[PDB]
Structure formats: C-alpha cells, structure tokens
Symmetry: C3
Subunit: 258 residues, 3 copies
C-alpha cells in the first residue's frame, strides 16, 4: 500500500527505500513526504534498533518536484504555497524528532532537500557515483531542511555559503571533506560495506544507541526547530508572490534549450 517507498523490517532494523512513482527520479512531493513520515513513525514505535534509508535506481533524491509544485501554484497560489511550506516543515521536523539512528546509503545524486536532510540523519555512507548539490538560488528559493544552520556547522561558513548561494556540486569525496558524508566506499563493494556495518550496529544494545544519539542531538534540537520554522516562513513569502517561479522557469528554459 505504500506507493512511493519500499519498507522492509528484518534483522533488528527498518529499511526504507525511496522509490517514487507519483514523482520522477525520487523527487519529493507532499505524498512522498507523508509516506516517509509514516514509515519513520512506525520504526520509532516498534522494536527497530535503527533505520537504514537508501534509494532504488540511479538518483538518491532530486529534492522538491517543482513541476508538480508549479501546477499546484497555478490552481491557488496563496493556499498551495502555504501547503507546500507546511509539508516541508512537517517532513523536516520528522527528522529532527526521530529518536533512533538514521543511517543513510547514498548511491546517486542528492539535490536540494534530498541533500539538506542528510545532516539531520546520523551517519551518511556514499560511493563515488553520489554527488551533492543545493541549487536553491537557481530555483529561486531560500534554503530548507535546516541547512541555513546545519551547513555552516558541518563545513564552516565559506563552504556553506558557496553551496547555498552558488549551487556548487560536490563529488562524494568532496562532500566527505565538507562534513556531509561520513565515509565513501568503492561502488562495487558499497552494498556489502554498508550491510556489514548495519549488522554490527543492529547487534549493539539499542538503549546505548538511543542514549548516545540523545546526547548528541540535545544541544541542537531547539535550534533545529527554530531554523526549520524560520526557513519555512521565508519560503511561504517567496512561493506566495507572483514572481516566485521565475528563476525556476529560466532554469527549465536553459535545460530544454541545451
């Protein structure tokens, strides 16, 4: 009955795989976002020791589906812009509140909100096929997923502003240098290197896992909530204005002209 994700619960952990059918290329829309929240809600309440999040196919996550979004905005700009900003806020908050470890395997591009959510997970393992970009300014939006606070925290201001203002694309290795990725594995053995460590993690006392994450997350929880809310209030402002989609349209024009 989930349409856009595959969920598997086995060997002490829940595995959630992004596999979107209501949107292309693992892009996010409110329906995809709700299914991830539902799957994480169940994992938070069952005996899962941790969650592994990964993706089916060649893209980890393209971030927001702006074509889906523009169609909504043409129907009722004021109502739909509010609704998208709240959907994002709730989606992001799910990651902020989640009490067990979220381990991410990134095997392809992670773009926009698909990259911004990574600092809200616990461990990120990538291979060289993965790259990371937050092309917010290109799409004409301010940042999301608490990246306005988290990117300066993990890579420092100079690097964070380059990603957030300049739309710099990072290889897996460069994202590791910039604190986005925990470790990079060869593509050929990526799955086995990820699964061996998930098995090791799932063999630990899940109380010790939870206590440790609680210790790491507690100095930042408030600040994350406050960031998420500020960012979403800005997005409402931008997406509710008549010119909100102009940068995105120019981007699409370039893409189709290429």
């Amino acid at each position: 009955r989930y349409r856009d994700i595959v969920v598997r619960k086995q060997d002490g952990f829940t595995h959630i795989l992004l596999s979107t059918k209501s949107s292309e290329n693992n892009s996010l829309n409110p329906e995809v976002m709700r299914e991830v929240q539902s799957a994480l809600s169940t994992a938070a309440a069952d005996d899962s020791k941790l969650v592994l999040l990964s993706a089916v196919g060649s893209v980890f996550c393209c971030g927001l589906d702006f074509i889906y979004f523009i169609r909504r905005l043409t129907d009722d700009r004021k109502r739909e812009s509010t609704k998208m900003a709240e959907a994002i806020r709730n989606f992001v908050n799910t990651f902020i509140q989640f009490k067990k470890p979220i381990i991410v395997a990134v095997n392809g591009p992670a773009i926009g909100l698909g990259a911004s959510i990574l600092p809200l997970c616990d461990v990120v393992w990538a291979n060289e096929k993965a790259w990371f970009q937050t092309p917010y300014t290109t799409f004409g939006q301010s940042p999301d997923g608490c990246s306005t606070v988290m990117f300066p925290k993990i890579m420092g201001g100079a690097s964070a502003n380059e990603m957030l203002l300049s739309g710099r694309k990072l290889t897996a290795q460069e994202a590791c240098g910039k604190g986005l990725v925990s470790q990079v594995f060869w593509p050929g053995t990526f799955t086995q290197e990820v699964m061996v460590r998930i098995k090791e993690l799932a063999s630990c006392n899940p109380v010790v896992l939870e206590e440790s994450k609680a210790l790491v997350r507690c100095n930042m929880k408030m600040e994350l909530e406050q960031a998420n809310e500020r960012e979403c209030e800005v997005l409402k402002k931008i997406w509710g204005s008549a010119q909100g989609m102009d940068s995105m349209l120019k981007y699409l024009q370039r893409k189709i002209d290429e």
Copy 2:
C-alpha cells in the same frame, strides 16, 4: 575620492579592490579601514546585489600596519591604543552587520586581520598564490576579527588554536580543508572562474540572496558582536600598557 581602494559599480554588483597608498602590502591602517567601510555603506544602500572584494598587487592583505601603529603609539599610548582598538572594532562590526553577500577573491597572502575578516564574508575563492596566517602571538597580540569564535567554528579547536597560538601558515589547499576558503582555483584561470560565478550570482533574485544570507547569519550575529567586543577589550589592555609592543619584532 578614495586613495587606498578602487571601487567599480557595474553589472549588478560593486567590486572593491584593496590597493593601499598610505600603507604598504595592502596593510590596514585606520584610513584604509574607513574607506572600506564607506565603500560598503554605499553598496549597502544602492542597487548592488553583492560585493566582490579583491586586491591589487601580489599581497591580498597584511593585516594591521604595525609600523604606522608604532609611530602613533609612542606619541600617546592611551589615546592611540584606544583609537586603534576602536577602529578595529568598527571595521569588524561593518562586516558583521553588512546585509548583502560579500564574495572575496584572494590572490596572495592574507595575514592577521586580513585572514580573520574572511569568516565574516560569505564565499572565499582563492588561487595557489594565496596563503593564510594569523601570527598574533608572535606580535604579542591576542586575536581579532572575531577569529576567537569563528576559527574554532570553521576548523575545530585543535586547528584554530594552532593558527591563533602557533602562527601556522596555511597554503590555499590547507586553508580550504580548514574551512577558511570555499574553493581553490588554478592561477591561470582564476579571474575568469571568479567572474563567471559572480555573473551567475548577480543574475539571481537579489531578495532571495539577502533572505538567504539573513537566515545563515542570524544565529551568530549577537555572538559575533560580543566576540568583537571581548577581543577589542583585550587589545586595549595589551596595547595600553607599556610592555605590549615588546614582542613586535625585527
């Protein structure tokens, strides 16, 4: 007319170039800092979308002109140590409050306050001729430019203390690994690379740029102001006293 800087307003941005006459090696005396501040006031008020900061010459910025400063010190410690501290504090504060993006292109050495000011700008692009150092302890001064808070935040305590206490020099690649530089470019195409990126940023919605900067900068602004205040009080204490020019050496 500005003596120590060149200012070009064009194509959606203001380009400020350090090219000091009252000092050597783009050193900063209170006159240079006032001109930078005044050029930033006007960019903040006009239709400029962002500021590109770079330098003419083989040096980006040597930080404080300590000989200009020595001259002034032994004509009146109390008045001149107070004036220099407060000039640093207002210069640093201009960057803390500035609302639009400041992109910096660093094409040679950035030393002391010339390096410290970098974390208060937005993006820093460097070539291999650039290197970076904060030789505070060697000069017998404590740090400035909010580096006492910003350096630990961008590179971690161990690396920050090595910069601030030990006077370590970082190559452009090392400064990039330590969070001081956004990206390092080949010197051959450095100007081209910077300008293509500046043109892309200047084509963006200016309101989206400023909103984005505001969201990044808001959690830190009070901390940066308080750090700037603390640093400048410790400099008054040091420079005010008789034996605080004792390390300034040759």
Copy 3:
C-alpha cells in the same frame, strides 16, 4: 609519580604518560589522579604551557577496563558510581585548565584517550597514530564531552560514525576531521614538535592565556553541562539490566581489534 613522568624546564611542564599499573597507557582512577595532580602544579607554577605525550608505542588506550572489570566483580553498583565520578573529575580538570595544553600523539589514542583531545589546545600527531572511540561495541555511551565536541569539530555525520560505529581514523583522516592540528612524519615527528614547543614557550605567558581564555569562554559552561550529562548516562547504563553484556569482550581483544 608511579604512572607518569613530569619534567619542568625551559618555560613549560612536560607530562609523559608511562603507566605501570595498567596496559597500554590506560587510565584508571590512580593514573587519572596523578595526571590531575601534575596539572594542578603546572597551573600554579610559572609554566607557560603543558606538553602532554606518552612513552612507548601507544598514546592512551582510554579507560583501563581490566581494572574496572576487577572492581565490577567486587561491587557493581558502588564501583560504577565511583568510576563515573573519576571520569567526570578527570574531564573537568581539562575543561577548567587555563594554560595551553599541547598534545603530541605518537601511537593509538582510543576511547577517553581520544575524547579528551578536543579539550586540549593543539594536537600534533605522528603519521603512525590512529584514533578510535569504540564506545558502542563495549556497551558504553560516550565520554570526555565528545557528545558535543565531536559534532563541533567534524560535523554530525563524521561524529556519529565515530561514536556509534567505532570508525578508526588514521592521523591524516583525523586531521581532516578536526581532531589533529597537523601530522608530522615518524622520522621528523619529535623534532617538529620540539621546535614548535620552544617557539611557543618563548611567547608572552599572559598573551597565551588571554588568547586561550577568549577561545574557551563561549564553550566552558556547555562543556561542563556535557560532561555531567555523559557521566549521568554512564551511571544509568552501568546500573542497568543489560549494562555489562558487552564489556567482557574487552578481555579477548588486542587494542587494534576494538
């Protein structure tokens, strides 16, 4: 002192770890009390800084678990309380210390042996050194304020990987992740350190101290609060029903098998 060598000369105090009552420079409450005593004396005398290093092929393999297990067989409840307080007091000595502590790491730093390092000022490592916090594998939550300091120095992805997954970092990898100031080759390491210590010791002691005070002031209360939280969780874990399930594992492992 039985477990450390203290040399005061040339404007600095050199504290060398060289334990007799433990394997691999490991820390029992005895060793901890000597280190604290040596620091207390350096803090009050005319030393400008402290150089901390080790004798032998291991910097510090962290908590002396052989000693702790010897106590735990006697009285679990009483001895777990005393151990948590020993740690808390030890870590607090580093949080409070006003003079620069420079560390020369010439072999593995494990557990508390690695977690204290972000409480020091400058860390120089031999290319031979490596770094690990294998807390979870032995059923422990983290110590030494690493729950806050690791995310601050390497960002949450890398920090969680250290603290949850037991990742080992080479000296170079630990330099990229903010734990080590600079790495020197084994051949030149001793001389590289000493030329720099000599340079630092020739500086104005008041300038050194004011600089450190400016660097440490935004964080002192947060470090204290982190130390107290971590020590509380350690008490609760060690007092738990499953709290000892993973500790004895230690007896069967060499230090490069954690």
